[PDB]
């Protein structure tokens, strides 16, 4: 599952970290797949069967195949006992056996002399395409995203 | 969509000397310091393979002689020392609004000028019995590809009733061959007598003309 | 290895519809975005459509918008292309392409790293017809320097392709099978020629073997030299 700069996140927007891209949901929505966000349910019952209850999880509230429930959130199983710090854990389709690596917050990079965690400082060139003339690539709270550069109503940059 | 236009259409190169391919886009492919343009090579009988990505970066496994430069709407692929294995069709592709390929540039082998051997074939008895008549003008093993075929019936220029096709460059002697077919009804064929194709080529001082008389050869 | 196999092509009339299929093997199909790319005879590659792994992101070329629809079935490791309102300009070889995306340290880029063998789509009003093979006989008017030229005219067939061989594959040197041309009748025509020593024209037989699978037609034509 690979998200590109041309991915259209449904009810969401593209964010970039040191080594990857993902879709972040609008408001309080939950990821149903790598690129769509839907409304979640508060409790799992007969009326909410097979409905989204958390990111990559439906009611049975078990995580989808290939994930595992750690700290009440669904994380890939290869990211189980992998700690990163100043960043998140992801995986790449490059290796045959899926391996969990660290993708760091903007300004940080994998520190090779620190068990490949996110401690070393390093720039990351923004790869997002904010083609609208009212949006530009900004760095917010550790991630890259397209945001307004001059005036927005409350949510459109025009 | 965004329009991509390359030049030249065919680029003859002698192995060892450099080569350039131009590629322009109908609108700027630059955004945030990235140029969204890639280069692909389709060797004969093989799949296309990535060469250059984001304007100037070589893909993993590309020789250093291949390089890409340019920005915005003006781009150029440059081969410093052309090897013989680099023949094929080169495409530039814009990735700003996925996707659009250029029309392709055919990289071919440059050789010495060769004149075409010209032969003309009258229609067969079988085809005449069928009710039609096709005359075939054959140009064999010439270089370069540029060649003009002119049909004349009783020394009168024909137009819009002939069709030609050209073979790919030969893998051994690096020449081309061309076949032109003049098609007429059995009636129009039996009306006239003299049939000829006039070939103009760079390797001919004067335009060669091959002809025959109906009922003769 | 990665293997993409396209199917579903064939013949269709203008206005008609066709549904292409592409089955992916050798990799996890549900992890990759995919393309459809075609190439018309005597033209370059033309990208048609892109589809993400979760089918949430889809793009089309302007030349096929509204007429063509892309979709995938990750359960069956398959990918489809519905083609409606087909015009003659849609006649091409259609490929499905795997689209890798690398998060490289010099920028993120696509890599069309796998291409199927292709499937041929012919949009035309013509009906399937086997070829008539006419001889291009050698004579003094086709000889030059101890060398004689002869051939076969493969005329008025539909659709592509035909396969021409000489002397059941024994004779391969000096052969030139030209690309077919599309005539006004909607039927194809090509010629295949071979160069031989002019001395052998009396003591050697030359037969062109023309095969046209669409019409289930096989024709072997012996090319007799002429006395002129």
Author numbering:
A (entry chain I): 1 to 60, 71 to 164, 168 to 171
B (entry chain B): 1 to 27, 27A, 27B, 27C, 27D, 28 to 213
C (entry chain A): 1 to 52, 52A, 53 to 82, 82A, 82B, 82C, 83 to 100, 100A, ...
Lines quoted from the article behind this entry:
We determine the co-crystal structures of four human antibodies bound to Pfs25, and describe three novel protective epitopes on Pfs25, including the most potent mAb yet described from any organism.
2544 binds near the canonical Site 1 epitope but on the opposing side of the 4B7 loop when compared to the previously defined mAb 1269 epitope. This shift from the prototypical Site 1-binding site puts 2544 nearly 180° across from Site 2, an epitope not previously described. The 2544 Fab-Pfs25 crystal structure revealed that the antibody buries 1005 Å2 of surface area, and the majority of this interface is contributed by the heavy chain (713 Å2), in comparison to the light chain (292 Å2). Correspondingly, the heavy chain forms 21 hydrogen bonds and one salt bridge with Pfs25, compared to four hydrogen bonds formed by the light chain. The HCDR3 of 2544 contributes the largest buried surface area (BSA) of any CDR (368 Å2), and forms seven hydrogen bonds and one salt bridge, largely mediated by four tyrosines (Y97, Y99, Y100D, Y100F; Kabat numbering) that reach into a pocket of the EGF1 domain of Pfs25, immediately beside the 4B7 loop on EGF3. Despite a slightly smaller BSA (241 Å2), the HCDR2 forms 10 hydrogen bonds, five of which are mediated by T56. Indeed, 2544 recognizes the 4B7 loop at a shifted angle compared to other Site 1-directed mAbs of known structures (e.g., 1269, which has been shown to be of intermediate potency in SMFA, IC80 = 63 µg/mL, and murine 4B7, IC80 = 29 µg/mL). Therefore, we propose that potency is primarily determined by the epitope that is engaged and is possibly related to the angle of approach.
